[PDB]
Design a protein around this nucleic acid. Structure first.
Ligand code: MG
Lengths: 413, 48, 146, 1338, 67
RNA sequence: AUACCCUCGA
């Protein structure tokens, strides 16, 4: 939830009123999750249980209580409606029947924190987690961190990178299950059943006859997305976590995506640390790492980046994607194909010629930027309507229809 | 006038009640209404 | 650096480190119990002992012996994960009892041995398994030169 | 070479001279053939050839005729660079007014015509006529006529009245000014009118007219009949990839102007109707205005974008406002950056450098060495080797790196220390390794910081890097002589842990023959690091200069202290290392070592200290654990007690006995007391939480708990943070600032609840939001500070003056805030210094006070000394090297060419980010002394002092004043001058509670005009609380009682009239409303009896206010001239208190409105310096009444209070330097050689007066009054226009320079920076001096 | 040893003419127009020029006479 | 290889 944009406060109109938290933010907007910098407090995040009202306002859940006991019924209440009710903290003494046995419990009548006698309390909180955001709810022992470092930790955890092999946190807040499931990175069984066949690329599920229509009983083909460039140039791949023949229910996790460990959220990796000054190598905030952490390859990450070439309608003529680049050396041409494009799966050093374009004959051939070295994993070709489809596009298409044909062949089978 | 005289209290922008949260639907509808009013004016000019 | 704890007044690192040490100790204990070819009854009672201590509620005895309990042990051999919620999480004494249950020092500290001179440090330091992150601020993208 | 860049109006003839053609076609390039068209915005006829040494047709392609223009190709063949100098012109059908000389806040074109900008705008926008050449007619030249009015005037007259419209009319007005006649008439009429406003306006008129007359500028040039066009490369169209073209805003604006001009000519040539013609003229005026500037009147917009077009004014303004990003910023070559990394194996003078960064940066050096060694023949081979990274290229890279320092700086460089030279060492990686000890100076932690690296090239640059900005050179901070390269957190922890003591430890007791035996025993493991042992040592003391005496002594110490002493150089005693070695102790040790041993041994000592600190912090496995935060056991009891108390108070409030407002204060005080008690108990438990056995009976010792070490050592953390970590967090503030009624009882070890966390979030959000604004304000403040104090560089050696500021220890309150030693250390004495008995010279003359001199002054009882200050040193254009004392970054006196102004500004602005009553009770026992007290003894010896200026001091036994207090008016004091008063005594028993009126004379008073109901009211309080009479208010009185005021006529006990000394009139003080006159009229009142009794921010904004010399909303009212004060007539609504000095009566006195309370009592000495009504002082009144030194002391103390609140120490030299820069201008009262009132530099007036003394007459010398200008005002008012134009308000200063015809001799720092010359300070001083020698002397 | 920027700048007490005349001497040395008054210990021209300043073997008068 | 907008780090 941001405050900038059209009809919104600009960073030059900040002041202090918008950039401070108020007792009305409790359970509606996270108090500790905001970006540190020029726009602090202007951009916030909704709380875990936050809810938009019918008229557009924010609402948070609460439990209605009577004089004697705490009633189970739960009502969503917005900021205006909190004045009459005295709201109790999510933690309070209970007599095993809902009766607050304490003498003075922490409450707030009119946004004024104070103690009150249980006989006058009218509403009770739902969860202590409903105050912080989803990002802030993932910090273990958040109650032992000051709000500055909690803010920094939430914003930091927001910026992690998926490592080669995800490792679930040994100590978490249990909210990792929820954030992993609610995001779409994990392949979730839309209908329960028994897994028919599994491999690194797809999952096929025999849908239970009970949870199926009359005809076409078992059809649920889950195509896992393999290594795919994200918006931040990080890899996005999903791995199966189910074998053949095991029964699955509606909502189970068949494949876990990036930064996930069998349905949990696994951003980083847990490792044995010691808190001691070691020869001044961890001086101000530095970290000193054993060579095992590199040998075990724990924090390595995969970065996918793309490079493009466009065939412009140059004034003299159209430029063609041809391998006969003028004044081209042999080894570089050997790395290339006949159509002028690098074969998929070729190690590329700096300055090598990935794609060959001749523009009238001058060369617009794509080469990798300096300092950039990697392995080619995929090549995509788009051709304008009414233009000749090159051989590589033909091969890519025939592979795609072969895959499609085999998918419906086994689905029919 | 009553607020000036002392009856009642002035509103403060701190309350999340005095603010409201939009979403993709609301401003998407606003942009659609802007385009619709432009098209409507053009049509009224043409279909007169 | 221990010096970053007292100034930036956050104790979550220390408590997380202690609980992670307990988690890895439990994982190692479970792994060594699995390697000794212990029967499913012993595994079940140890898991129940882990899951009856302080908080939550034990959910076992609803799992088949050979399949589910052995799969649980094979998944916990790398460390038993504890879920400590935001403000209703693990107290100090629960972590202490977990540590004393895992045959680790109740204080969470023991004297380490130096890696070069090989002589024990005079005072005991804090060691444990902390969930460390890697951020998208790599020096590979920051190193520029002209 | 060149100098003295001029600014003036552009003449149409000179505009033609500038141009190389007449741009006539709006379009730029043909879509078919891609060459610029004839008469277009890029035409080759006008601006030059597209290709270097080529023509349009290719008739001549040879590189021989570089100036010949071909026959078919009129486009002269020349180099392609010429497209940057060649400009064109556009001939406008009608003249158009210049936007800058129109819309500037003082409108120059309006001022030159004595007509308001509104009327001119009416004429320009074709709304009303104006009259030219009135002739013999009723109409006047300044008269504006409407359509009907002009039609009637034309019908009535018919001729002899030229009325026009538009900028053509303004142009016709301007060239008929006759500046000589106007100047003469306005000078004749200047003194005729006595109105201050009118005289000011006519003075501005005179200034403009004389500026135009002298500057060779013509008034008609303001309205440009022809305007230039920028060369094409400075307004380029950068083609977008894909064949698109990106057109600059300048091209769009030029095209618009050209189109409208072409429309104008082709609609006048066919005689279009008058209305459309005038509309077209208006459009052309608007288009030229938008081209020159935008947003002033019309705010022109672009196509399909809400972003306004960028005009030339915004172009010359630069990015980042007016701070020129191209002429001052100027991205450089041979540079790179990366994340920084701590290197603990680095010596202080060197820094790690990645292989790839070093190889890329030093590429030309590598090529040169490769060619010199012959390993490469062609540069292609050299590039191949350097890109292949052949093994032999690393050798040559090492050779080029060996003695070539590099520059490292952080992103925000708040002071010179933020960029230092390092001697690079090749490392394996991609990060820049930094020395741990330079992080404090850089303010750079290793949490993700990046550093830019720059490679100096010239031998001058390398030598300047090695000799001025090498990391070893700058150990001491330029802001204060205290060191800045000092052990930080981890090394401080190591050194502190090493030098501790344990009551019982392994190895305690035996004696060691040397430090070597101590090391041998410790490394063998037979002795603890901190065990009380005995060891004999060989310390070499430097007590005598030139004689290093070595003595052997046995000292009781610990093993760790003996080990650390093996690091200490050979000029310091062992007693300097025998304590616990906290951070402050280590910093003082380094400071002492620098001033005793030297610099090279000091950097060696610092490196060794860092090495041992790291080594022994690694050896000590110190760590933070959950058990380290020791919660005091009494915290629970204290919290329960406070909870019981607050429950009782809440019940009482529920009963209604206690008000909510008082309950709030009571509960907050209770909770604060409980928090303080809990914190004290926690600290007392933690500090001594060690029980040890000493061969039997248990004992206590200082704690070895890790968090306690981290606090006590000062390595990292503070008591305020342990208060949160192991004690209750205490009260927290709501966003409105009100402290929440309930505190946070839990700590971070116990963990906070949800509500307590939410409150701590209130606090943390407030702080974090405040941080960014603090940084922005600090950056702006330091930018203004630098731009106001840049021309100030030490030039002379000894100016010769003997004026300075009396410096005394700052004793505001009961304690000494700053000892005299710290204030005058590094300064220079202005006059003789005497013993307590005079005639004995202690410090003779301007001897630079050093450590020896400050110790000598402390040994004697010197209390007040006078030192030479930069506010003194009346030298011209600079400051003498004495009055600016010892340099702070160096141990010696400053050297000629040091830009102390920029250092001062950086010193003040760097720590900005760290920013955001009855009686006297003597503290300690001392002989009481009186200063500035004027009071006569009472009847019994009470000695009531009614004078407002007065203070009470308790001088120590030696003679120095240990404490001073401000004695208010009407204070009864048991005068015991010379008699020691015990501590805690109440010598002065003042209790004003009111404004008492003393009665210096005695006798039976005659209260004349005391009317019971009209002037007074015998109102007695309940229970006979007062047997007195209450004075009737002037308005509450009757119609006749309003004008009647009570008067206690002075009579003796028998009826003899008495009068106060100095004035014949009696001291019959009137009794105003709300008075308390208990003494009966006619009763003998003793001398000094009370007659009439009348009852009565901080951070970056405050320092900015002091540096701008602003006026608050309600300034403190001050007395004007000392003398006999009077009573203010409240009937008129403003109190008029006439002053009648005894030396000479001056009846002039202003009237102060009664809207603000006035605490002035009539019938006393005015004391011009003193204050009439309370409030924050206005820096000015202090300057113009008290003087300059008084203003200096006030401003310095006010800024230093703000800085000392956060504990940042800044020397006063810098604040005084900025003050000197602000007080650089003076205003003249009686000129005789200049204008009556003018803001002229004090140097100019001094030079004029000195020349006039030995000149025509003797009375030609002028009298002037010093004036104070804020930094943002003093910087913009410099003689140089280039310096001001690149600071702020570029348009205003540029127009002012244009009309005034200013000349800028490049004699400042920014002038040479922007023009690319050597700095007039530092090492460029020699070059500038030689240039002056060759220029001024022929 | 190292360039004595501490004691040499103290004798002349200006530290800026030190840099100026050191650069003069270093340019003479790179041009080969004079001999190092101090025996080379494998340093580059700037450092050896500075140690010649420190040892007092070369001065402004000596460099000018050599010039 | 020009200007805005967004996001992020110190
Ligand atoms: Mg940092």
């Amino acid at each position: 939830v941001s405050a900038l944009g059209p009809g919104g406060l600009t960073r030059e109109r900040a002041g202090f009123e918008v950039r401070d938290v108020h007792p009305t933010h409790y359970g509606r907007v996270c108090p500790i999750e905001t970006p540190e910098g020029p726009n602090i407090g202007l951009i916030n995040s909704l709380a875990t249980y936050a809810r938009t009202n019918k008229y557009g306002f924010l609402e948070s859940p609460y439990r209605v209580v009577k004089d004697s006991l705490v009633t189970d019924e739960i009502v969503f209440l917005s900021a205006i409606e909190e004045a009459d009710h005295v709201i109790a903290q999510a933690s309070a003494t209970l007599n095993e029947k809902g009766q607050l046995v304490d003498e003075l419990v922490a409450v707030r009548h009119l946004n004024e924190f104070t103690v009150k006698a249980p006989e006058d309390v009218t509403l009770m909180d739902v969860s202590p987690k409903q105050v912080v955001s989803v990002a802030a709810s993932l910090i273990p022992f958040l109650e032992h961190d000051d709000a500055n470092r909690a803010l920094m930790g939430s914003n930091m955890q927001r910026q992690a990178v998926p490592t080669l092999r995800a490792d679930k946190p040994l100590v978490g807040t249990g909210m990792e299950r929820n954030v992993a499931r609610d995001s779409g990175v994990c392949v979730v069984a839309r209908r329960g059943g028994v897994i028919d066949s599994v491999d690194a690329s797809r999952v096929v599920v025999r849908v239970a006859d009970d949870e199926v229509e009359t005809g076409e009983a078992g059809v649920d083909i889950y195509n896992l997305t393999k290594y795919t460039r994200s918006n931040q140039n990080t890899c996005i791949n999903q791995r199966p976590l189910v074998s053949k023949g095991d029964v699955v229910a509606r909502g189970d996790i068949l494949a876990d995506g990036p930064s996930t460990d069998m349905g949990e959220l696994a951003l980083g990796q847990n490792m044995r640390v010691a808190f001691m000054p070691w020869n001044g190598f961890n001086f101000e905030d530095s970290i000193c790492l054993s060579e095992r952490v590199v040998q075990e390859d724990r924090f390595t990450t995969i970065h996918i980046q793309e490079l493009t070439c466009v065939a412009r309608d140059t004034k003299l003529g159209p430029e063609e994607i041809t391998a006969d680049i003028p004044n081209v050396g042999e080894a570089a041409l050997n790395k290339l194909d006949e159509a002028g494009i690098v074969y998929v799966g070729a190690e590329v050093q700096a300055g090598d010629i990935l794609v060959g374009k001749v523009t009238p004959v001058k060369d617009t051939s794509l080469r990798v930027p300096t300092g950039t070295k990697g392995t080619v994993i995929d090549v995509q070709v788009f051709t304008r309507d009414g233009v000749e489809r090159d051989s590589r596009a033909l091969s890519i298409e025939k592979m795609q229809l072969d895959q499609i044909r085999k998918d419906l062949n086994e689905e029919f089978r | 006038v009553d607020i000036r005289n002392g009856k009642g209290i002035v509103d403060d922008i701190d309350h999340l009640g005095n603010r409201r949260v939009r979403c993709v639907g609301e401003m998407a509808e606003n942009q659609f209404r802007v385009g619709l009013v432009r098209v409507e004016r053009a049509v009224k000019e043409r279909l007169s | 650096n221990p010096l970053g704890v007292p100034s930036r007044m956050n104790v979550g690192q220390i408590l997380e480190t202690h609980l992670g040490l307990a988690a890895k100790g439990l994982g190692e204990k479970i792994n060594r119990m699995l390697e000794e070819q212990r029967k499913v009854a012993e595994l079940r009672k140890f898991l129940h002992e882990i899951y009856n201590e302080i908080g939550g509620r034990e959910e076992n005895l609803d799992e088949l012996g050979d399949n589910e309990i052995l799969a649980l042990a094979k998944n916990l051999r790398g460390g038993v994960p504890m879920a400590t919620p935001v403000f209703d999480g693990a107290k100090e004494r629960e972590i202490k009892a977990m540590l004393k249950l895992a045959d680790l020092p109740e204080s969470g500290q023991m004297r380490l041995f130096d890696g070069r001179t090989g002589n024990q440090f005079e005072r005991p330091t804090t060691v444990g398994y902390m969930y460390m992150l890697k951020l998208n601020h790599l020096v590979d993208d920051k190193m520029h030169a002209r | 070479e060149f100098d003295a860049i001029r600014i003036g109006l552009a003449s149409p003839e000179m505009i033609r001279s500038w141009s190389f053609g007449e741009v006539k076609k709006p379009e730029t390039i043909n879509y078919r053939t891609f060459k610029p068209e004839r008469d277009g915005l890029f035409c080759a006829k006008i601006f030059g050839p597209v290709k270097d040494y080529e023509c349009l047709c290719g008739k001549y392609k040879r590189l021989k005729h570089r100036g010949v223009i071909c026959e078919k190709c009129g486009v002269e063949v020349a180099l392609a660079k010429v497209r940057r100098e060649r400009m064109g012109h556009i001939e406008l059908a009608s003249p158009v007014a210049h936007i800058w000389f129109l819309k500037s806040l003082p409108s120059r074109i309006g001022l030159l015509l004595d007509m308001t900008l509104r009327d001119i705008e009416r004429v320009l926008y074709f709304e009303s006529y104006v009259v030219i050449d009135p002739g013999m007619t009723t109409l006047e030249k300044g008269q504006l006529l409407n359509d009907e009015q002009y039609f009637e005037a034309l019908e009535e007259f018919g001729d002899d009245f030229d009325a026009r419209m538009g900028a053509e009319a303004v142009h016709e007005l301007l060239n008929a000014i006759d500046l000589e006649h106007e100047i003469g008439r306005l000078r004749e009429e200047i003194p005729q009118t006595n109105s201050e406003t009118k005289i000011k306006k006519l003075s501005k008129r005179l200034k403009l007219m004389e500026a135009f007359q002298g500057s060779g500028n013509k008034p008609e040039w303001m309205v440009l009949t022809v305007l230039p066009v920028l060369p094409p490369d400075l307004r380029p169209l950068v083609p977008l990839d894909g064949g698109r073209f990106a057109t600059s805003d300048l091209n769009d604006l030029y095209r618009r102007v050209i189109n409208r001009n072409n429309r104008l000519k082709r609609l006048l040539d066919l005689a279009a109707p008058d209305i459309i013609v005038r509309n077209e003229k208006r459009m052309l005026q608007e288009a030229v205005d938008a081209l020159l500037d935008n947003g002033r009147r019309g705010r022109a917009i672009t196509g399909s974008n809400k972003r306004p077009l960028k005009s030339l004014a915004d172009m010359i303004k630069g990015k980042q406002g007016r701070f020129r990003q191209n002429l001052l910023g100027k991205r450089v070559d041979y540079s790179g950056r990366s994340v920084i990394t701590v290197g603990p194996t680095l010596r202080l003078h060197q820094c790690g450098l990645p292989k790839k960064m070093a190889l890329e940066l030093f590429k030309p050096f590598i090529f040169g060495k490769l060619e010199g060694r012959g390993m490469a023949t062609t540069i292609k081979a050299a590039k191949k080797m350097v890109e292949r990274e052949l093994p032999e290229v690393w050798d040559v890279l090492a050779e080029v790196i060996r003695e070539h320092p590099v520059l490292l700086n952080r992103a925000p460089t708040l002071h010179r220390l933020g960029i230092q030279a390092f001697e690079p060492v090749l490392i394996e990686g991609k990060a820049i390794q930094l020395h741990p000890l330079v992080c404090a100076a850089y303010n750079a932690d290793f949490d993700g910081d990046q550093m830019a690296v720059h490679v100096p090239l010239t031998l001058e640059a390398q030598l300047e890097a090695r000799a001025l900005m090498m990391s070893t050179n700058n150990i001491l901070s330029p802001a204060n002589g205290e060191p800045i390269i000092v052990p930080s957190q981890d090394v401080v922890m190591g050194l502190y842990y090493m030098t501790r003591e344990a009551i019982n430890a392994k190895g305690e007791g035996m004696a060691f023959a040397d430090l070597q035996e101590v090391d041998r025993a410790y490394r063998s493991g037979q002795a603890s690091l901190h065990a009380r042992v005995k060891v004999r040592i060989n310390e070499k003391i430097k007590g005598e200069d030139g004689q290093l005496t070595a003595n052997t002594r046995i000292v009781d110490t610990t093993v760790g202290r003996a080990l650390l002493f093996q690091v200490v150089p050979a000029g310091l005693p062992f007693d300097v290392v025998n304590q616990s070695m906290k951070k402050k102790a280590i910093s003082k040790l380094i400071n002492h070592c620098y001033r005793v041993v030297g610099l090279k041994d000091t950097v060696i000592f610092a490196d060794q200290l860092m090495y041992t600190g790291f080594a022994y912090s690694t050896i000590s496995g110190v760590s933070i654990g959950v058990n380290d935060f020791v919660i005091p056991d009494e915290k629970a009891r204290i919290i329960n007690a406070a909870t019981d108390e607050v429950k009782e108070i809440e019940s009482q409030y529920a009963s209604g006995l206690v008000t909510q407002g008082e309950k709030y204060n009571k509960v907050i005080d209770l909770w604060s007391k409980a928090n303080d008690e809990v914190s004290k108990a926690m600290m007392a438990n933690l500090s001594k939480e060690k029980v040890v056995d000493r061969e039997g009976k248990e004992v206590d010792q200082e704690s070895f708990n890790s968090m306690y070490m981290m606090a006590d050592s000062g390595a990292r953390g503070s008591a305020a943070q342990i208060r949160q970590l192991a004690g209750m967090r205490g009260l927290m503030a709501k966003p409105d600032g009100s402290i929440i009624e309930t505190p946070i009882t839990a700590n971070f070890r116990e963990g906070l609840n949800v509500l307590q966390y939410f409150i701590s979030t209130h606090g943390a959000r407030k702080g974090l939001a405040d941080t960014a604004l603090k940084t922005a304000n600090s950056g702006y403040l330091t930018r203004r500070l630098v731009d106001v104090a840049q021309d100030l560089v030490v030039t002379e050696i000894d100016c010769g003056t003997e004026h300075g500021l009396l410096m005394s220890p700052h004793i505001e309150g009961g304690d000494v805030v700053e000892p005299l030693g710290e204030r005058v250390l590094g300064r220079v004495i202005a006059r003789d210094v005497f013993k307590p008995g005079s005639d004995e010279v202690i410090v003779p003359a301007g001897t630079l006070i050093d450590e020896k001199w400050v110790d000598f002054l402390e040994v004697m009882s010197v209390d007040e000394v006078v030192v030479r200050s930069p506010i003194t040193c009346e030298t011209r254009h600079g400051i003498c090297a004495m009055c600016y004392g010892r340099d702070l970054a160096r141990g010696h006196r400053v050297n000629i060419g040091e830009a102390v102004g920029v250092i001062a500004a950086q010193s003040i602005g760097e720590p900005g980010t760290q920013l955001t009553a009855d009686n006297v009770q003597v503290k300690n026992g001392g002989t009481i002394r009186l200063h500035n007290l004027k009071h006569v003894v009472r009847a019994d010896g009470a000695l009531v002092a009614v004078s407002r200026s007065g203070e009470l001091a308790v001088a120590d036994d030696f003679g120095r004043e240990r404490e001073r207090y401000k004695l208010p008016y009407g204070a009864v004091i048991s005068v015991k001058e010379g008699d020691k008063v015990d501590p805690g005594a109440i010598v002065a028993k003042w209790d004003p509670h009111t404004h008492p009126i003393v009665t210096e004379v005695d006798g039976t008073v005659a209260f004349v005009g005391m009317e019971e109901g009209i002037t007074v009211k015998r109102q007695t309080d309940e229970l006979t609380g007062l047997t007195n009479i209450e004075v009737m208010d002037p308005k509450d009185r009757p119609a006749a009682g309003k004008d009647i005021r009570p008067a206690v006529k002075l009579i003796d006990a028998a009826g003899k009239d008495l009068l106060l000394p100095g004035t014949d009139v009696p001291a019959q003080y009137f009794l105003p409303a709300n008075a308390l006159v208990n003494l009966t009229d006619g009763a003998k009142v003793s001398i000094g009896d009370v007659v009439a009794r009348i009852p009565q921010t901080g951070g970056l904004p405050r320092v900015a206010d002091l540096f701008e010399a602003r006026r608050p909303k309600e300034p403190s009212i001050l007395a004007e001239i000392s003398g006999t004060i009077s009573f203010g007539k409240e009937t008129k609504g403003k109190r008029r208190l006439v002053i009648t000095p005894n030396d000479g009566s001056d009846p002039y006195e202003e009237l102060i409105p009664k809207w603000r309370h006035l605490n002035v009592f009539e019938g006393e000495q005015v004391n011009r310096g003193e204050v009439i009504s309370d409030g924050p002082s206005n820096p000015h009144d202090i300057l113009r009444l008290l003087g300059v030194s008084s203003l200096a002391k006030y401003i310095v103390n006010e800024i230093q209070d703000v800085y000392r609140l956060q504990g940042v120490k800044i020397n006063d030299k810098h604040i005084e330097t900025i003050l000197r820069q602000m007080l650089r201008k003076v205003e003249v009262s009686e000129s005789g050689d200049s204008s009556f009132i003018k803001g002229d530099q004090v140097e100019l007036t001094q030079v004029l007066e000195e020349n006039e003394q030995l000149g025509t007459e003797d009375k030609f010398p002028a009298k002037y009054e010093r004036v104070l200008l804020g930094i943002t005002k003093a910087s913009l008012s410099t003689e140089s226009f280039i310096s001001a134009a690149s600071f702020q308000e570029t348009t205003r200063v540029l127009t002012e320079a244009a009309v005034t015809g200013k000349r800028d001799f490049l004699r400042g720092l920014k002038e040479n920076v922007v023009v690319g010359r050597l700095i007039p300070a530092g090492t460029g001083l020699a070059y500038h001096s030689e240039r002056k020698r060759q220029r001024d002397l022929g | 040893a190292r360039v004595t920027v501490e004691d040499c700048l103290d004798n002349v007490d200006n530290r800026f003419e030190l840099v100026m005349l050191a650069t003069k001497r270093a340019r003479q040395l790179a041009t080969g127009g004079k001999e190092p008054k101090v025996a080379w210990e494998n340093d580059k021209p700037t450092v050896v020029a500075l140690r010649e300043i420190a040892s007092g073997l070369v001065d402004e008068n000596v460099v000018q006479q050599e010039d």
